[PDB]
Design a protein around this ligand. Structure first.
Ligand SMILES: CCCCCCCCCCC(=O)OC[C@H](COP(=O)(O)OC[C@H](O)COP(=O)(O)OC[C@@H](COC(=O)CC)OC(=O)CCC)OC(=O)CCCCCCCC
Ligand SMILES: CCCCCCCCCCC(=O)OC[C@H](COP(=O)(O)OC[C@H](O)COP(=O)(O)OC[C@@H](COC(=O)CC)OC(=O)CCC)OC(=O)CCCCCCCC
Ligand SMILES: CCCCCCCCCCCCCCCCCC(=O)OC[C@H](COP(=O)(O)OCCN)OC(=O)CCCCCCCCCCCCC
Ligand code: HEM
Ligand code: HEM
Ligand code: HEM
Ligand code: HEM
Ligand SMILES: COc1c(O)c(C)c(C/C=C(/C)CC/C=C(\C)CC/C=C(\C)CC/C=C(\C)CC/C=C(\C)CCC=C(C)C)c(O)c1OC
Ligand SMILES: COc1c(O)c(C)c(C/C=C(\C)CC/C=C(\C)CC/C=C(/C)CC/C=C(/C)CC/C=C(\C)CCC=C(C)C)c(O)c1OC
Ligand SMILES: CCCCCCCCCCCCCCC(=O)OCCCOP(=O)(O)OC[C@@H](O)COP(=O)(O)OCCCOC(C)=O
Ligand SMILES: CCCCCCCCCCCCCCC(=O)O[C@H](COC(=O)CCCCCCCCCCCC)COP(=O)(O)O
Ligand SMILES: CCCCCCCCCCCCCCCCCC(=O)O[C@H](COC(=O)CCCCCC)COP(=O)(O)OCCN
Ligand SMILES: CCCCCCCCCCCCCCCCCC(=O)O[C@H](COC(=O)CCCCCC)COP(=O)(O)OCCN
Ligand SMILES: Cc1cc(C)c2nc(SCc3c(C)cccc3-n3nnn(C)c3=O)sc2c1
Ligand SMILES: Cc1cc(C)c2nc(SCc3c(C)cccc3-n3nnn(C)c3=O)sc2c1
Lengths: 62, 54, 385, 51, 126, 49, 385, 126
């Protein structure tokens, strides 16, 4: 039929389409997945640079 | 309101994900270095260095 | 045009991981090639930090690995990552190559993509051998003895190749000092073969699970396949955490915690688990010249697969006889790995003899007969004559 | 007409500034992320009132 | 790469034989339904790889009313795969409309290629 | 000798990463909602075409 | 098209060293960039063979270099090539960079070509330091002491950077075992910066000694500039033969044939000859924080030269005041190298103070004043007004 | 990158001054002969770098009888350099034909660029 007759999307649609409903919960989750990836990535770079410090048998000869 | 508080501003969305991660490591390391201790008591060194006080 | 497609170097980043046209139909098996770029970064980075505390002399080798594990700050984190990570490097690569012969990408126009991938698999086996000889445990001495003794079967050349490979008359101190220096270099040759491997992909793109062309429905890389990438990268580092912190010695042999002795011999000499199917093929041929030829011409039998597929459809999606013979080849690579960790006994010598023939009848007798029967059965099922 | 810009478009004078006081509150805050585990001048971090 | 000419040479010999075509034709029918390509809304000539200079010739010579309806069957199949479902049973190709629309254009692009090489490797004598 | 220290740092990472893995399944299936619900319809062109 | 411009990899070879359009006018100064691709191949190849016989422990370091020189077959050929070849690596690179600021190629549109070249010069100085500390002679101990002590002047950060750079409390055994592992890696980072360096050249090509455009008269690379290349490659390996076989110890210090002792101090501690002008700049500033800032901001003063040339003609061919100040900058880099091998005395502290000011007045006061006077003198010499 | 507007601003001030143009003009003449660009068969406006969007504008607007004679002076100079000789003294540009043929096209491509930016950074008020 015509191209001015869109198919039905109400099987997947929300019933109250306030704009801030999905604009908040889609920035709390991307906000939470950039907080653990900033603390879970400073601790890995720090583990690799703590190994170049003074070794345990060098601190015994202090 | 809620979306334009701290989610509109990327300078916050880079800032607060960094500022929150500074206090995240400290309230969470202390929370698990008190669960590991309390789960295993009577098997640490500080516990058995109190019944050898005689 | 934007700055990301105007710069010299950013347009190389933009043409590969931002605006590269991907098919709309690919599933989670096209992610194993992305983990291998992370797997190679981990093994290089953890190894440069462990090379600051290592001594490659034969009288210091089984004490610098323990100095790392007992004295270096978080040194047990570095080693257990560099010993369970290499066994994670291989489980992904066995699943990368198995996808590419299911969807059958080796075909035209991607044959250079398949040929530079076989070179990477040879150079990856060689690093894991050369670095496992650097611990100098008890499995690390008798594994280098058995393998380097095979090169004496070359007629008129043999005992002048082994004595050049040994630097002496057995597995001596110059054997361990040359195996570490070659362990640093071949990981840097693999990285230059991965750059050539990505170039041959940019001119034709990826395939799809349907097999048919996909230039009619495409999606860029950013925001869809980068967020589909991070689902498996967070699953990768989570099972790389449940080994390095909870069972760090399950994928290993306890005899490697004894220092190596050229005078006492172990009751069993068996490889690391990912060289086990290639070990049963060498032991199955009762000659040390026809045994070293057969095991090297079993990684190089993959190159005859572009010339042996006789079908007109690409990939084993709608092929129900070419799917039953893909899962015979899979459980035959598992039975071959099991036999390479057994004793040389009855019946583990006739079982490893039949099952190393099914490794070769697949690429040469099973593929072209079944990929020809299907071309006639797709024809006489339709054509009314 | 003949006013302030050189190589920068200077009409962004404080149309660049107060948000990079908060990207400066997001990149010096980025240096409040990697200074951990390195107890050398982290006396300038660990005097906060909670925990 | 098993030449359609050769596929049709073997295939006609089974169809002409009245005793061979009671053995191979039911096996040819269960092999089609177990392939399952009709449920994704595709005929068999959609499945053929097109990355050689004979299939690129046979696609240009195709009429445009058939060339447009084939570009839609491919796109409708890429979307059925992504959602991991199957099409309804009102959009499956039946056993009558699965006919070779590309085999006439293929068989004559091959026979013209088996004359250009026979005329360039030739041992005519006086 | 690291056995008690190892299993304590073995809860700092499997609590961070198992939570970081659960967020990437919510986040992926939000941005992949438009592509999974596209529709298609074929009006065949006029018989000149 | 031919096969060399149809293949994936051969068309990379064809676009660079076969059919690359070169100007018809370039002379023998455009050959120094080709020797540096051979210089880097020699130093990597001779070093992997010398890494098979080396022990990086502090009690074995000054005996594995001698085991190479008397016991290894042709081991003196390997070492003398890897010790006179690195001093040949630097004489070409000083002549490569000096050409590029004469013809003035740093200008638009080649500024990324000049910026990735400054990164290569920093990473090249760092390898020659890290590898000269691996001999562990007497100059090899007190050279690492003086340099690593400079990083204690950083306020509130200092003594926690040196103790991380040392792995202890002085130049100990962990200092020598980490300096060899970083000596293997940074030559592989230089090779990836040379690949990025050639990419920025392919989009604009080379300049010419006239300065003007050269898109009107061009010549391919094959049969003309390959046979012009081999004139200087056979001259390079001939003077690399008259040192390794006739005077193999002229470019070196005799104190490096004494094992290093942390208790006796030498009468003079002087660097290798190509770090000598940068040594006199550090010793000229009487503060160990303002001395380490000045010497690092003397390799990074080259980046301000694209923004400081005010002339409209490219290159110092027709510029007779900008040619007299190019040869003042040359003999000032020679007087700076001479003073870095002297004693701290009168007048070698005021001479090294004036001559480290002329290193900085060139890039900032001498260039923009003289490249502006010439723009007016090319104008009022012609225009009749 | 000094600008000819600025070069011509300073240069006209020396030429208008009768006491400054007895000091700078003989120094401007020995600087030209010691440059030696005339012996290679080139005028001065050939020497100017053309890799900016103002010199690319001033070359299109040049007349074609002058645009052809300049492409030959460049090619004749690339060949004199390669043979390491100099041209004969019958093919040197004299002191009368070395005139700016490109400075009128340059000075108006700059003044039109100093109006497009002055009109885009502007603080008009009511
Ligand atoms: C050493 C290992 C390191 C880690 C690497 C893991 C390797 C994974 C390779 C397996 C693979 O990729 O096959 C994909 C297969 C299904 O194929 P498909 O892409 O068509 O389905 C997509 C789905 O419908 C949408 O998946 P969706 O995007 O909606 O959700 C994601 C899902 C898990 O995500 C993954 O990463 C799966 C690997 O989240 C959940 O299920 C919630 C759980 C709480 O997924 C399967 O479940 C089949 C499992 C059998 C494979 C065994 C082979 C091992 C030898
Ligand atoms: C330790 C480093 C060793 C590395 C290998 C040597 C490095 C060479 C670097 C010098 C250089 O590149 O300058 C080249 C420059 C040539 O000027 P031109 O190109 O305008 O003229 C080409 C000619 O007419 C045709 O030369 P033609 O091809 O006809 O003959 C061959 C030529 C020898 O070939 C060469 O490689 C010369 C370097 O014959 C000779 O010229 C005799 C010289 C022995 O020559 C000169 O102008 C001399 C300047 C003195 C250089 C001072 C360097 C200070 C360190
Ligand atoms: C040089 C020598 C080369 C050696 C390489 C061989 C290595 C073999 C190692 C086995 C790992 C590889 C497993 C197979 C991975 C490739 C298979 C593939 O790409 O997908 C095939 C199939 C996809 O099926 P669909 O998802 O399309 O089904 C939808 C219906 N339309 O996917 C499936 O149906 C899932 C079936 C899963 C089979 C699991 C078998 C793996 C057993 C591993 C044992 C591990 C022991 C250590
Ligand atoms: C593709 C890359 C690599 C692979 C597959 C690989 C693999 C291995 C393996 C399996 C071991 C044995 C571990 C054990 O059982 O203890 C090992 C040991 C070792 N490897 Fe790596 N490696 C790679 C890269 C590197 C690199 C670049 C270095 C550079 C220094 C390196 C340094 C070492 C060292 C020092 C050992 C000593 C033994 C130990 O510390 O465990 N590796 N390698
Ligand atoms: C360090 C090793 C490797 C790396 C980094 C790597 C990387 C990649 C990547 C990123 C892709 C893109 C498509 C995808 O992600 O699945 C790919 C595809 C491919 N790889 Fe690899 N790969 C490696 C090893 C191999 C090996 C060992 C083989 C074969 C013996 C191989 C053969 C192929 C083929 C045929 C394809 C194309 C698949 C298709 O497009 O359908 N690769 N590779
Ligand atoms: C850009 C590349 C390189 C440069 C400029 C360079 C430079 C040097 C220098 C100047 C020395 C001191 C020589 C002496 O006075 O005795 C040295 C020592 C040494 N370098 Fe290299 N090197 C390079 C690459 C390499 C590589 C890649 C390796 C490892 C494979 C290596 C291995 C060694 C070794 C083992 C020594 C030990 C001391 C000796 O044998 O003389 N070098 N390097
Ligand atoms: C390992 C070190 C280097 C290699 C292999 C290398 C390679 C090359 C090559 C092959 C060329 C073209 C041929 C030629 O112009 O002679 C070139 C040109 C150039 N190089 Fe390098 N180079 C190196 C170091 C440097 C450094 C240290 C600098 C600057 C600080 C630099 C700046 C330039 C520039 C500006 C050009 C262009 C010159 C022109 O086209 O007129 N390069 N380089
Ligand atoms: C302007 O026009 C030009 C131009 O004028 C010139 C001259 C060149 C050519 C100049 C060059 C400098 C060539 C390019 C340089 C390279 C390709 C160098 C980079 C490569 C390396 C450094 C390779 C390093 C060597 C190895 C990795 C070998 C490792 C050693 C091994 C494997 C031996 C150990 C083995 C055993 C068994 C012990 C151009 O390419 C060019 O076009 C841009
Ligand atoms: C199909 O679509 C895709 C696609 O899915 C993906 C993932 C990619 C992404 C590409 C890859 C994943 C390739 C991976 C690349 C590599 C693995 C190269 C990395 C090689 C290295 C050698 C990196 C390691 C380098 C180092 C310098 C090691 C670090 C050591 C240090 C810093 C020393 C530490 C000591 C001190 C003192 C700092 C594509 O390009 C692409 O388009 C084709
Ligand atoms: C006689 C002379 C001597 C002989 C010499 C032989 C011939 C000499 C010619 C030299 C050839 C030099 C040409 C340069 C070259 O090889 O080009 C690069 C190849 C193109 O592939 P690629 O895009 O680099 O790989 C593919 C790469 O671009 C992949 O990049 P990606 O991983 O997507 O991004 C980086 C990660 C960023 O990720 C983040 C952080 O988001
Ligand atoms: C180059 C990276 C290689 C390492 C990755 C390998 C991951 C699998 C093993 C995990 C090793 C982590 C060791 C634990 C540790 O050091 O810190 C541990 C705990 O820190 C953590 O829990 C981080 C876990 C999350 C790591 C994975 C998230 C990846 C984020 C992006 C990283 C990109 C750089 C020490 O904790 P601390 O802060 O008290 O010192
Ligand atoms: C093939 C193996 C080689 C190794 C990998 C090759 C490169 C892969 C990508 C690596 C990341 C590169 C991203 C850098 C983007 C920097 C932007 C840029 O280049 O701006 C450059 C200036 O950069 C420099 O000065 C040198 C930077 C050195 C880079 C060393 C990493 C200017 O960009 P441009 O001049 O094109 O802008 C004009 C717009 N009208
Ligand atoms: C290495 C750093 C990366 C920088 C850019 C890469 C520069 C390219 C290096 C020059 C390589 C020259 C290759 C020319 C020959 C290629 C012929 C060819 O297309 O082969 C293709 C595939 O074979 C290969 O993968 C060889 C790749 C060469 C890589 C060397 C390990 C055709 O294969 P073939 O003609 O043998 O027929 C199939 C019969 N097995
Ligand atoms: C092409 C190729 C190359 C090589 C080099 C190779 N090597 C092996 S088996 C080595 C081995 C044995 C026989 C016994 C115990 C332990 C180890 N061993 N040595 N390294 N690794 C990881 C081990 O498991 S097959 C193979 C095939
Ligand atoms: C940016 C930068 C980096 C480094 C690392 C560096 N280093 C020096 S001077 C080292 C030295 C001294 C002071 C005395 C004796 C011998 C050596 N010495 N050490 N290595 N080499 C080749 C030497 O000559 S300036 C410089 C500048």
């Amino acid at each position: 039929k015509s191209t001015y007759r869109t198919p039905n999307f109400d099987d997947v649609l929300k019933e109250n389409n306030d704009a801030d409903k999905g604009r908040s919960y889609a920035y709390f989750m991307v906000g939470a997945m950039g907080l653990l990836s900033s603390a879970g990535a400073k601790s890995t770079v720090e583990t690799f640079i703590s190994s170049m410090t003074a070794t345990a048998d060098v601190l015994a000869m202090a | 309101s809620l979306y334009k508080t701290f989610f509109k501003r990327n300078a916050v969305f880079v800032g607060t994900i960094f500022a929150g991660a500074f206090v995240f490591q400290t309230v969470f390391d202390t929370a698990i270095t008190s669960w590991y201790e309390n789960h295993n008591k009577g098997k640490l060194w500080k516990d058995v260095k109190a019944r050898i006080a005689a | 045009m934007a700055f990301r497609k105007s710069n010299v170097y950013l347009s190389l980043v933009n043409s590969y991981i931002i605006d590269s046209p991907q098919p709309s139909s690919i599933n989670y098996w096209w992610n194993m090639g992305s983990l291998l770029g992370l797997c190679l970064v981990i093994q290089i980075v953890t190894g440069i930090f462990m090379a600051m505390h290592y001594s490659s002399n034969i009288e210091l080798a089984f004490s610098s690995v323990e100095h790392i594990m007992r004295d270096v700050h978080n040194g047990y984190i570095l080693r257990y990552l560099h010993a369970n990570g290499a066994s994670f490097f291989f489980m992904v690569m066995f699943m990368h190559m198995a996808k590419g012969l299911y969807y059958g990408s080796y075909r035209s126009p991607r044959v250079t993509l398949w040929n530079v991938g076989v070179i990477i698999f040879i150079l990856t086996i060689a690093t894991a051998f050369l670095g496992y000889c650097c611990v100098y445990g008890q499995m690390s001495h008798w594994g280098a003895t058995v393998i380097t003794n095979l090169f004496s079967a070359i007629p008129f050349v043999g005992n002048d190749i082994v004595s050049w490979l040994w630097g002496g008359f057995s597995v001596s101190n110059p054997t361990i000092q040359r195996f570490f220096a070659l362990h640093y270099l071949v990981p840097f040759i693999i990285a230059a073969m991965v750059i050539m491997h990505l170039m041959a992909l940019h001119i034709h793109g990826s395939s799809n699970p349907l097999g048919i062309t996909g230039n009619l429905d495409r999606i860029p890389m950013h925001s869809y396949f980068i967020f589909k990438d991070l689902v498996t990268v967070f699953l990768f580092m989570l099972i790389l955490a449940l080994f390095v912190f909870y069972s760090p010695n399950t994928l290993g042999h306890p005899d490697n915690y004894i220092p190596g002795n050229p005078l006492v011999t172990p009751a069993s000499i068996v490889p690391e688990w990912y060289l086990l199917p290639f070990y049963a093929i060498l032991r199955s041929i009762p000659d040390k010249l026809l045994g070293v030829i057969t095991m090297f011409a079993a990684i190089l039998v993959l190159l005859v697969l572009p010339f042996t597929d006789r079908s007109v459809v690409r990939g084993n999606t709608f092929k129900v006889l070419s799917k039953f013979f893909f899962f015979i080849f899979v459980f035959n690579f598992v039975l071959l790995g099991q036999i390479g960790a057994c004793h040389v006994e009855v019946p583990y010598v006739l079982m490893g003899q039949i099952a190393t023939f099914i490794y070769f009848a697949y690429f040469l007798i099973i593929v072209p007969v079944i990929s020809t029967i299907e071309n006639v059965l797709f024809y006489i099922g339709r054509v009314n004559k | 007409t003949g006013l302030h810009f050189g190589r920068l478009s200077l009409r962004s004078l404080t149309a660049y500034a107060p948000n990079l006081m908060l990207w400066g509150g997001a990149s010096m805050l980025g240096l409040f992320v990697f200074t951990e585990g390195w107890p050398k001048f982290q006396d300038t971090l660990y005097k906060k009132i909670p925990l | 790469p098993q030449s359609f000419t050769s596929i049709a040479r073997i295939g006609d010999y089974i169809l002409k034989s009245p005793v061979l075509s009671k053995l191979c034709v039911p096996v040819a029918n269960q092999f089609i339904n177990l392939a399952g390509y009709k449920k994704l809304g595709l005929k068999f000539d959609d499945l053929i790889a097109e990355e050689n200079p004979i299939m690129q010739t046979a696609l240009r010579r195709l009429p445009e009313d058939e060339s447009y309806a084939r570009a839609y069957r491919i796109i409708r199949a890429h979307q059925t795969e992504l959602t991991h479902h199957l099409l309804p049973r009102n959009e499956w190709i039946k056993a009558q409309e699965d006919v070779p629309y590309l085999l006439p254009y293929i068989l004559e692009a091959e026979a013209a290629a088996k004359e250009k090489d026979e005329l360039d490797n030739i041992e005519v004598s006086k | 000798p690291e056995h008690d220290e190892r299993k304590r740092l073995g809860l700092k990472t499997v609590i961070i990463l198992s939570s970081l893995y659960l967020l990437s399944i919510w986040v992926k299936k939000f941005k992949w909602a438009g592509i999974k619900t596209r529709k298609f319809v074929f009006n065949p062109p006029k018989p000149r075409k």
